[PDB]
């Protein structure tokens, strides 16, 4: 289980035990994500919200192998002290699903 979320606050995730990496540059984080989907880091990668909205497209390009490395947008900490916009996140997830701006 690996994360790419923060420069220093990923040490709390390491303090949970679960491994990770932080770079605060998008392309070295994505390159360690690339060696993390080659050497599969135990099936979970949690990626920062306000650094990568969609982490999955480049990863399914550079690996059409199956979705055992699961990719989540995990929340940035600073924006976590604002408000999650749970509603708008589910709006963009449903519009990523079927395109429609239909609201459940």
């Amino acid at each position: 289980m690996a994360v790419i979320a923060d420069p220093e606050t990923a040490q709390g995730f390491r303090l949970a035990g679960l491994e990770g990496y932080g770079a605060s540059s998008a392309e070295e984080a994505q390159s360690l994500l690339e060696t993390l989907v080659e050497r599969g880091g135990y099936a979970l990668v949690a990626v920062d919200e306000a650094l990568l909205p969609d982490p999955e497209r480049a990863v399914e390009r550079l690996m059409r192998g199956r979705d055992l490395p699961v990719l989540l947008p995990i929340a940035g900490l600073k924006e976590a002290f604002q408000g999650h916009d749970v509603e708008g996140y589910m709006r963009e997830l449903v519009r990523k699903t079927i395109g429609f701006d239909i609201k459940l």
Binding site: M1, T9, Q11, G12, F13, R14, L15, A16, G17, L18, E19, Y42, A43, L44, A46, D67, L68, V70, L72, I74, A75, L77, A80, F81, L93, T97, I98
Partner: protein, 112 residues
């Protein structure tokens, strides 16, 4: 997340950064977490469960007092994270199957 981030900031705050740095580089990597079967619609989607070496504290006579409470908070964080993970991938699979069925209906009707 608000609980765990506030506890982590306050724990690296009242103590030093170096104590939690060496502590976090001391913790075992919590490995063997893997993904097993949810075969449904004839489609195995991987749900995730961990292994959690948690109660075996690293020599549980521990001198910092806010590392362990923060570590319990981040284990609760990992709990909620894997719950959101194995719900989110199932929602994605059912959405793409709706897209498959819909393009199959429209193709089959408006062609054959």
């Amino acid at each position: 997340a608000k609980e765990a981030y506030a506890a982590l900031l306050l724990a690296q705050a009242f103590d030093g950064p170096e104590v939690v740095a060496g502590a976090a580089l001391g913790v075992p990597p919590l490995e063997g977490v893997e993904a097993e079967v949810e075969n449904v619609w004839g489609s195995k989607v991987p749900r995730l469960k961990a292994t959690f070496p948690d109660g075996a504290l690293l020599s549980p006579v521990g001198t910092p007092a806010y590392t362990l409470e923060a570590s319990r908070a981040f284990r609760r964080y990992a709990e909620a994270l894997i719950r959101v993970a194995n719900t989110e991938t199932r929602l994605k699979k059912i959405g793409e199957e709706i897209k498959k069925t819909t393009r199959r209906v429209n193709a089959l009707e408006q062609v054959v």
